[model samples]
Target: GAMGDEELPLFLVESGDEAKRHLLQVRRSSSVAQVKAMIETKTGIIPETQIVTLNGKRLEDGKMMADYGIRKGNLLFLASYSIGG
Candidate 1:
């Protein structure tokens, strides 16, 4: 599918311990799964391994950014926990 025409840049942080941050552009209506792809491209962290949260609340795959109060200036925290078993 094509990317959204109305994109918003959001601050993405990788592991709060690190200062590394990225500004990812996503649609306000984009799903968590979609945003995960952008993260994968920027941070090389695959969606399955990514733990995305807003204000410490994990965002579900089936949920939309708008569903979790995500906004243009919102800061999303990304953590990678690829369970290899």
Candidate 2:
């Protein structure tokens, strides 16, 4: 089975106290910037103001899906700047 989605890999994003939240489907060839744009729209957060983190590390906008070890059920944390000061 092809590990990738038919078009893109659907990633699940979440906020604080997460359970089931927003989902993002990004293309393998798409830039992280483009992925951020979609997440911005889906989450209604500023793409520049917001930060997407995987395992407490902020993801750069220059990477691709191959760089990210995310799956459909994986939880991505979305926040504005930082979680705590």
Candidate 3:
């Protein structure tokens, strides 16, 4: 069964701008850094400019998604910054 794949959908939404939402396939063992890269690929938002937050808390690059208690179809907020000075 495909249930053994261990992949789940994680919704990444632009902070305060829910209109921009991306559906990401995430594994429980996937590191935070890896997920950040995935986001960058999908939205062209650099990892450094990404503040991946779950339930108002920011996650660490070295940790796993499972470590942050992220479950299937969890809604994660993203803060993308652009500098033009």
List runs of model 2 lying over 4 Å from the truth.
1-6, 17-20, 82-85
TM-scores, all candidates, are 0.82, 0.65, 0.83
Model 1 lDDT tens row, 1-85: 7865577778888784658988888986899899888888988877887898887689888888888877776889888775589
Q: Pick the candidate with the highest TM-score.
A: 3
Write model 3 residue lDDT over 13-56, tens digit each, in one string.
88768898889998867887898888888988778778888866
Clashes per prediction?
A: 0, 0, 0
1-85: candidate 2 lDDT, tens digit per residue: 7664544655545665466477666765566678778887777778777677766567787876546765544456776666465
Question: In model 1, what are the clashing residue pairs, if there are any?
Answer: none
Q: Select the stronger candidate by lDDT from 1 and 2.
A: 1
What is candidate 1's local distance difference test score?
A: 0.83
Pairs clashing in candidate 3? none
